[PDB]
Design a protein around this ligand. Structure first.
Ligand SMILES: [Zn+2]
Lengths: 107, 125, 124, 95, 242
RNA sequence: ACCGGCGGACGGCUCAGUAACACGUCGGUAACCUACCCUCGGGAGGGGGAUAACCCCGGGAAACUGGGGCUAAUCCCCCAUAGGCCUGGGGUACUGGAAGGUCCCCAGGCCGAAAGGGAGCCGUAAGGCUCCGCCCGAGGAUGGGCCGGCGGCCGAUUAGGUAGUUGGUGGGGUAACGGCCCACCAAGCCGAAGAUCGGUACGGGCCGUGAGAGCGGGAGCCCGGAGAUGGACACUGAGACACGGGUCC
């Protein structure tokens, strides 16, 4: 099934209502790529994105990182160190507002 | 009142100081512990925007549906088990996930009696 | 304890005022709002007052009153006590707006020596 | 005092005609409203009872003054549309 | 500090599509809710007073409007806060004048004179299509107007199509589809008031809007939004669009 | 003058508090409310009831306020039908990038409308026309609510902070999603790339200066946010926990 992204659906299936592929969750908004740095909590991962910010006065770049908490569907068991793709959705908890949609590279 | 606004603590663990008073639009209401009784009791609540809500406080009947789409109105006897809270089952409090016993057997609730005003359930096979 | 009795005749819309000094005020003291007593023990004739021929079984029903300080009596307040109550409707409060509420001082249903004016209705 | 009619516009929604004109008068004071109205009526055959001078404006170091007038089809329409103050200023109302 | 809806509008905060002197006065007419949006409409008072000059003061402009001497589409409007939007027809029968409200090259609203035969036609872009009770198809147009058709004609209408409706009788004359070679008129963006024919349509993942390529009369190809492309004909514009 | 309707939640003032999704910008609400206004599709059937004003009598220094009688409404209430909300079983007709959405057919239930009122012109009458009106459904529009990515301040003579805290399973509540709250299950979450704590400060468009890089300010005008002696609460209303309404300390 296609949900608005040009990526392959998960091979397996799940019964999670919060999984955008096999549930009722809808994705709408930003789509980001990152690296999983934490997966200890249940159905929750921490996604880290690195980007360069330009400092005008010094005419030089400085490295900055962005950390985002995303839901982890049972179909896509993203582990720490995996290159992952996340999509914006409705609020799921106090800090979770994104959902993992695919695993591009396995660590 | 039951304030349902932002939390007072940051995810890091810091403290947040409110920059404004509580707003009327962020207030909730007391829970409606729908209890099994002999006569149904319901009230009408005027809500945000002039809308209407039906609150069921006492429930005596239930609409139990089978797998073929047939529904029957029966009487609730007791709440066998309520996974939401450990005291609801013993206090006979009906919620969305409750399991009740009626004249035709075991039924699992599927409606929200506090927001609907009626009790609907599916027969357990 | 002196009383000013406002007797109202429902069948004609007229009202009359009578003064009670020191004997029938005791008789009236202790009754609540809605209690019916015959008019014959109040030491009043009621015939030459209204120019009428009222029946022998005429009675006075206490409908309300005001005390020394000009405060009314609420039938829903028990006891001869003066209290401050947040009122939105009824005796002692005039809304004047849509849904406003104001705190006022009202007296109880029971008649007290502090009551000055007592309003009663003739019952046939 | 020479009057040149720069523009005449026909308003039909409000039954009137709007006249923009200029008054050339070097070495003379600003012409009075009565004189301006009299000359305009005599030149454009307008009804004296339904004509009103909105303004006569003089400028810095200029021998020409601008003038605006309105001629209504009916006196009742003129009373209904025009404000009371302008009618008082032009003398159409004793008030 | 804000406790409810606003009721005023400062001149400096007025929409950029108005021909208004933003510093002559302090207050501007706050448009009443109506057919079009805030950025594609102007209150009828400004059209009566500033655009056409038929009145000098708001008082006499309101008197003219109350006398029913101004017509928008085919219906008389007496509200001086009534919004007048894109592709609207303003008619003054007492003077026999008909104008089409259109954006210019810098996005400002202007009145373009038209003829009596064209004054009875108002194009409407189908903004959305849905179903109502009784299995009937409801079409919602770019100016908020609605029409209802039977389920039999569900395949004759689609989004981004144009319906030529006769006003005020509200009768559908014909339907102009959105396809290759269809004449279009850009109503918003950087290429406002530009016209041409459809060349290609590009679609994107997620909720990003579709883009359309238009070839103008000079052969130049320029891109814009599909919702900004307004079909006005099949091969030539069926309405005067200069 | 009174009843009744609408408005009084906008405008006007100030910068106290706030280092925070408060502000700027770009995106979401497929997770939400909206009186006044616009369009289309429908309806306005049958009944009851008080009271203001006015009259009689007053109480109180006032502020305010009591009893009886007699009345009308676009005032209030009831019945019916339309209609809304939930759940169960089926068909896939629609918009969308994608349907917990819309539409259609059965079933169990709860909630549940209206002012055919007013004016004018005709018409013997009946009845007709025009204007301003009332209720429901589907959309808009207008003003908001909530959410996300990014950006913008100093102090390490402040190095550990958090315990509803981080996440989940089931619910309650809300107009809405959400530890917002509750029951249960785990130990998570933040941090030397400056956590926590402390100081200062309404944020922006902009303003001052300098050849420029930059440095400094951000009261007056505009947009956004807060406050009404310091706090805490509620009623009515689409909109407030409300500067010229209410209660308590
Ligand atoms: Zn899945």
């Amino acid at each position: 099934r296609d949900i608005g992204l040009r990526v392959q659906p998960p091979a397996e299936k799940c019964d999670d209502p919060k999984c955008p592929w096999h549930g009722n969750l809808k994705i709408h908004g930003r789509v980001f790529e990152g690296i999983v740095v934490s997966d200890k909590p249940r159905k929750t991962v921490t996604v880290e994105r690195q980007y360069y910010f330009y400092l005008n006065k010094y005419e030089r770049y400085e490295l900055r990182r962005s950390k985002i908490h995303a839901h982890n569907p049972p179909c896509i068991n993203a582990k720490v160190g995996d290159k992952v793709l996340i999509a914006e959705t409705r609020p799921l908890s106090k800090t979770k507002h994104f959902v993992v949609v695919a695993v591009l590279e396995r660590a | 009142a039951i304030w349902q606004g932002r939390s007072l603590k940051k995810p890091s663990g810091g403290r947040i100081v409110l920059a404004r008073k509580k707003r009327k639009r962020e207030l909730g209401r007391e829970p409606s512990n729908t209890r099994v009784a002999e006569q149904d009791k319901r009230k009408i609540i005027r809500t945000y925007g002039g809308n209407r809500k039906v609150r069921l406080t006492a429930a005596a009947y239930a609409n139990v549906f089978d797998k073929s789409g047939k529904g029957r109105k029966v009487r609730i006897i007791r709440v066998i088990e309520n996974p939401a809270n450990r005291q609801f089952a013993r206090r006979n409090i009906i919620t969305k996930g409750a399991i009740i016993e009626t004249e035709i057997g075991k039924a699992k609730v599927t409606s929200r009696p506090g927001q609907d005003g009626v009790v609907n359930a599916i027969l357990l096979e | 304890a002196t009383f000013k009795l406002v007797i109202s005749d429902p069948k004609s819309g007229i009202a009359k005022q009578v003064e009670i000094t020191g004997a029938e005020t005791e008789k009236l003291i202790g009754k609540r709002i809605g209690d019916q007593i015959p008019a014959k023990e109040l030491n009043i004739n009621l015939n030459e007052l209204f120019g009428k021929e009222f029946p022998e079984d005429v009675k006075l029903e206490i409908r309300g009153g005001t005390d020394k300080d000009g405060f009314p009596m609420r039938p829903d307040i028990h006891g001869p006590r003066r209290v401050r109550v947040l009122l939105s409707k009824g005796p002692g409060f005039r809304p004047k707006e849509k849904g406003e509420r104001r705190k006022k001082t009202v007296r109880g249903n029971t008649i007290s020596p502090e009551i000055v004016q007592v309003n009663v209705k003739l019952v046939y | 005092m020479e009057i040149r009619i720069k523009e005449i516009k026909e308003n039909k929604l409000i039954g009137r005609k709007e006249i923009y004109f200029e008054i050339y008068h070097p070495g003379e004071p600003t012409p009075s409203r009565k004189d301006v109205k009299g000359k305009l009526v005599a030149m454009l055959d307008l009804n004296p009872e339904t004509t009103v001078i909105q303004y006569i404006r003089s400028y810095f170091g200029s021998y020409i003054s601008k003038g605006y007038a309105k001629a209504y089809d009916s006196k009742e329409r003129m009373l209904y549309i025009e404000p009371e103050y302008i009618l008082i200023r032009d003398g159409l109302i004793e008030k | 500090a804000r406790k409810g809806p606003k009721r005023h509008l400062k001149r400096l905060a007025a929409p950029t599509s108005w021909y208004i002197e933003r510093k002559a006065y302090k207050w501007a007419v706050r448009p009443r809710p109506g057919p079009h949006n805030m950025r594609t409409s102007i209150p009828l008072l400004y059209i009566v007073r500033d655009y056409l000059g038929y009145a000098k003061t708001a008082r006499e402009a309101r008197k003219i409007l109350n006398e029913g001497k101004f017509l928008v589409d085919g219906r008389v409007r007496k509200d001086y806060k009534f919004p007048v939007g894109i592709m609207d027809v303003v008619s003054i029968p007492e003077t026999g004048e008909h104008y089409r409200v259109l954006p210019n090259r810098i996005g400002k609203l202007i009145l373009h004179p038209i003829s009596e035969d064209e004054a009875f036609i108002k194009p409407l872009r189908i903004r959305n299509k849905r179903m109502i009770k009784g299995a009937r198809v409801q079409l919602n147009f770019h100016d908020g107007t609605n029409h209802i058709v039977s389920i039999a004609e569900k395949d004759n209408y689609f989004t981004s199509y144009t319906v030529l409706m006769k006003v005020p009788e509200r009768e559908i004359l014909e339907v102009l589809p959105f396809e290759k070679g269809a004449y279009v008129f850009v109503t918003q963006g950087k290429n406002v008031a530009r016209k041409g024919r459809i060349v290609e349509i590009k679609r994107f993942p997620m909720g990003w809007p579709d883009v359309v390529t238009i070839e103008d009369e000079e052969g130049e190809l320029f891109d814009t939004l599909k919702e900004y492309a307004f079909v006005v004909g099949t091969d030539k514009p069926k309405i005067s669009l200069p």
